[PDB]
Scaffold this active site. Structure first.
Site, PDB file in Angstrom:
ATOM      1  N   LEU A  13       1.032  -1.138   0.078  1.00 55.74           N
ATOM      2  CA  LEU A  13       0.027  -0.095  -0.523  1.00 55.74           C
ATOM      3  C   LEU A  13       0.736   1.412  -0.069  1.00 55.74           C
ATOM      4  O   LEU A  13       0.447   2.182  -0.514  1.00 55.74           O
ATOM      5  CB  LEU A  13      -1.061   0.207   1.674  1.00 55.74           C
ATOM      6  CG  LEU A  13      -1.965  -1.067   1.562  1.00 55.74           C
ATOM      7  CD1 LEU A  13      -2.856  -1.010   2.447  1.00 55.74           C
ATOM      8  CD2 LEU A  13      -3.086  -0.922   0.323  1.00 55.74           C
ATOM      9  N   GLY A  14       1.886   1.272   0.757  1.00 54.74           N
ATOM     10  CA  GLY A  14       2.738   2.656   1.080  1.00 54.74           C
ATOM     11  C   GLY A  14       4.181   1.798   1.695  1.00 54.74           C
ATOM     12  O   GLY A  14       4.539   0.733   1.887  1.00 54.74           O
ATOM     13  N   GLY A  15      10.052   2.068   6.199  1.00 57.33           N
ATOM     14  CA  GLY A  15       8.875   0.850   6.722  1.00 57.33           C
ATOM     15  C   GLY A  15       8.441   0.971   5.450  1.00 57.33           C
ATOM     16  O   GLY A  15       7.943   1.527   4.558  1.00 57.33           O
ATOM     17  N   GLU A  16       7.250  -0.135   5.347  1.00 55.85           N
ATOM     18  CA  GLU A  16       6.184  -0.970   4.408  1.00 55.85           C
ATOM     19  C   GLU A  16       5.010  -1.065   4.735  1.00 55.85           C
ATOM     20  O   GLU A  16       4.939  -1.230   6.385  1.00 55.85           O
ATOM     21  CB  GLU A  16       6.971  -2.061   4.094  1.00 55.85           C
ATOM     22  N   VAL A  17       3.511  -0.902   4.397  1.00 55.36           N
ATOM     23  CA  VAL A  17       2.424  -0.875   4.727  1.00 55.36           C
ATOM     24  C   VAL A  17       1.709  -1.626   3.916  1.00 55.36           C
ATOM     25  O   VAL A  17       1.803  -1.764   2.487  1.00 55.36           O
ATOM     26  CB  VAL A  17       1.736   0.816   5.039  1.00 55.36           C
ATOM     27  CG1 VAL A  17      -0.030  -0.028   4.774  1.00 55.36           C
ATOM     28  CG2 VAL A  17       2.214   1.891   6.007  1.00 55.36           C
ATOM     29  N   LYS A  32       1.345  -1.389   9.157  1.00 54.26           N
ATOM     30  CA  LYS A  32       2.633  -0.744   9.245  1.00 54.26           C
ATOM     31  C   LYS A  32       3.763  -2.471   9.435  1.00 54.26           C
ATOM     32  O   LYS A  32       3.626  -2.199  10.601  1.00 54.26           O
ATOM     33  CB  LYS A  32       2.584   0.061   9.215  1.00 54.26           C
ATOM     34  CG  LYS A  32       4.102   0.957   9.397  1.00 54.26           C
ATOM     35  CD  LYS A  32       3.216   3.135   9.281  1.00 54.26           C
ATOM     36  CE  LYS A  32       5.196   3.193  10.447  1.00 54.26           C
ATOM     37  NZ  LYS A  32       4.662   4.870   9.741  1.00 54.26           N
ATOM     38  N   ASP A 113       2.164  16.781  10.112  1.00 52.67           N
ATOM     39  CA  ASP A 113       2.622  16.512   9.416  1.00 52.67           C
ATOM     40  C   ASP A 113       1.240  16.183   7.942  1.00 52.67           C
ATOM     41  O   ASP A 113       1.271  14.920   7.163  1.00 52.67           O
ATOM     42  CB  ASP A 113       3.978  15.362   8.470  1.00 52.67           C
ATOM     43  CG  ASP A 113       4.032  15.262   7.704  1.00 52.67           C
ATOM     44  OD1 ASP A 113       4.489  16.294   6.759  1.00 52.67           O
ATOM     45  OD2 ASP A 113       4.297  14.204   7.152  1.00 52.67           O
TER      46      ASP A 113
HETATM   47  C1  LIG Z   1      -1.808   3.681  -3.015  1.00 54.55           C
HETATM   48  O1  LIG Z   1      -2.511   3.692  -2.082  1.00 54.55           O
HETATM   49  C2  LIG Z   1      -3.362   2.730  -1.426  1.00 54.55           C
HETATM   50  C3  LIG Z   1      -2.556   3.342  -0.237  1.00 54.55           C
HETATM   51  C4  LIG Z   1      -3.100   3.146   1.761  1.00 54.55           C
HETATM   52  C5  LIG Z   1      -3.958   2.555   1.531  1.00 54.55           C
HETATM   53  C6  LIG Z   1      -4.678   2.199   0.425  1.00 54.55           C
HETATM   54  C7  LIG Z   1      -4.613   2.720  -0.904  1.00 54.55           C
HETATM   55  O2  LIG Z   1      -5.182   2.076  -2.212  1.00 54.55           O
HETATM   56  C8  LIG Z   1      -6.483   2.289  -1.465  1.00 54.55           C
HETATM   57  C9  LIG Z   1      -4.252   1.875   3.027  1.00 54.55           C
HETATM   58  N1  LIG Z   1      -5.607   1.857   4.022  1.00 54.55           N
HETATM   59  N2  LIG Z   1      -4.699   2.374   4.909  1.00 54.55           N
HETATM   60  C10 LIG Z   1      -3.463   2.539   5.717  1.00 54.55           C
HETATM   61  C11 LIG Z   1      -3.140   2.758   6.510  1.00 54.55           C
HETATM   62  C12 LIG Z   1      -1.030   3.768   6.252  1.00 54.55           C
HETATM   63  C13 LIG Z   1      -0.613   3.688   7.854  1.00 54.55           C
HETATM   64  C14 LIG Z   1      -1.606   4.150   8.296  1.00 54.55           C
HETATM   65  C15 LIG Z   1      -0.747   4.595   9.471  1.00 54.55           C
HETATM   66  C16 LIG Z   1      -1.462   5.372  10.549  1.00 54.55           C
HETATM   67  C17 LIG Z   1      -0.715   5.187  11.549  1.00 54.55           C
HETATM   68  C18 LIG Z   1       0.521   5.482  12.146  1.00 54.55           C
HETATM   69  O3  LIG Z   1       1.128   5.837  13.217  1.00 54.55           O
HETATM   70  C19 LIG Z   1       1.106   4.812  11.207  1.00 54.55           C
HETATM   71  C20 LIG Z   1       0.587   4.961   9.738  1.00 54.55           C
HETATM   72  C21 LIG Z   1      -2.966   3.891   8.545  1.00 54.55           C
HETATM   73  C22 LIG Z   1      -3.303   3.476   6.863  1.00 54.55           C
HETATM   74  C23 LIG Z   1      -3.093   3.030   3.682  1.00 54.55           C
HETATM   75  C24 LIG Z   1      -2.427   3.238   2.377  1.00 54.55           C
END
Ligand SMILES: COc1cc2c(cc1OC)=C1N=NC(c3ccc(-c4ccc(O)cc4)cc3)=C1C=2
EC number: 2.7.11.1
Length: 263
Positions: A13-14, A15-17, A32, A113
């Site tokens: 989705l996006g 360290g790594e997510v 995460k 941020d």
């Molecule tokens: C690039 O596309 C996406 C990026 C995305 C998502 C969906 C996407 O496409 C559907 C998605 N859903 N939850 C996340 C996500 C990513 C990061 C956090 C987050 C929250 C708290 C924290 O301390 C650190 C990170 C919480 C949720 C995410 C990135």
């Protein structure tokens, strides 16, 4: 019930997510992969416009943070380069962004941020504030702590963060929300950073609104931007006063398209 605790990592989705799917229930969650502050701030958070924290697990060195999956993706991808988005959509996203920031500031948390990459959308396009990695406590035991650490992303930072040794936390989040509102309505960022050396920042201070991005923005949301993007943080508009602004309260958007039939 066996295997209910087993999650399959489906895609990045996006360290790594990673998008994680439950083996039994198929519930989707964001995982995460990496901290001690980020987890403790995330445990305090419970609001409809803040990304949900389900829990955390540590396997020796790697920290697994289990957070809300937002299928709508990032607000960043709803902004068309150099155009933005329809004003009613921007108003609705800005409403939800204010509700989320009111919540955070209310419990003494500053995100530090705010930008469209960190603003996520659920299935019904409800905005959710994410990434509390740079977040901190600015109010404890009803006593405010002035900030001095340099953080955020230069096009979104308030000018006091670059000119002053110490500054109040709340006007910094208000400023980044105003840069987010600029991005949503013009599809471009007004300056590289809010400094006198930046020509675009000087032109804004000189009220040259005949130039871009301001010429793409209607006078009502632009009058709001004039009150948010104020260089002196003590003169800058506060959220209670953003909530009384004419554009903020202007009827623009219809509700969610409800299914219907005729005759
Ligand atoms: C690039 O596309 C996406 C990026 C995305 C998502 C969906 C996407 O496409 C559907 C998605 N859903 N939850 C996340 C996500 C990513 C990061 C956090 C987050 C929250 C708290 C924290 O301390 C650190 C990170 C919480 C949720 C995410 C990135």
């Amino acid at each position: 019930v066996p295997f209910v605790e087993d999650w399959d990592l489906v895609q990045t989705l996006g360290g790594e997510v990673q998008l994680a799917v439950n083996r039994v229930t198929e519930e989707a969650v964001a995982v995460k992969i990496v901290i001690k502050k980020e987890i403790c701030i995330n445990k305090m958070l419970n609001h409809e416009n803040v990304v949900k924290f389900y829990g955390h697990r540590r396997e020796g060195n790697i920290q697994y943070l289990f957070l809300e999956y937002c299928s709508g993706g990032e607000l960043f991808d709803r902004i068309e380069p150099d155009i933005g988005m329809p004003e009613p959509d921007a108003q609705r996203f800005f409403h939800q962004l204010m509700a989320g920031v009111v919540y955070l500031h209310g419990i003494g948390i500053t995100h530090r941020d705010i930008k469209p990459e960190n603003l996520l959308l659920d299935e019904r396009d409800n905005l959710k504030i994410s990434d509390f990695g740079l977040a901190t406590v600015f109010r404890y035991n009803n006593r405010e702590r002035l900030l001095n650490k340099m953080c955020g992303t230069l096009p979104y930072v308030a000018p006091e963060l670059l000119k002053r040794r110490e500054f109040h936390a709340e006007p910094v989040d208000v400023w980044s929300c105003g840069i987010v509102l600029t991005a949503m309505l013009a599809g471009e960022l007004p300056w590289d950073q809010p400094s006198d050396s930046c020509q675009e920042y000087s032109d804004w201070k000189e009220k040259k609104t005949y130039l871009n991005p301001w010429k793409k923005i209607d006078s009502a949301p632009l009058a709001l931007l004039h009150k948010i993007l104020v260089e002196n943080p003590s003169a800058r508009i506060t959220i209670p006063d953003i909530k009384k602004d004419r554009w903020y309260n202007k009827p623009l958007k219809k509700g969610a398209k409800r299914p219907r039939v005729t005759s």
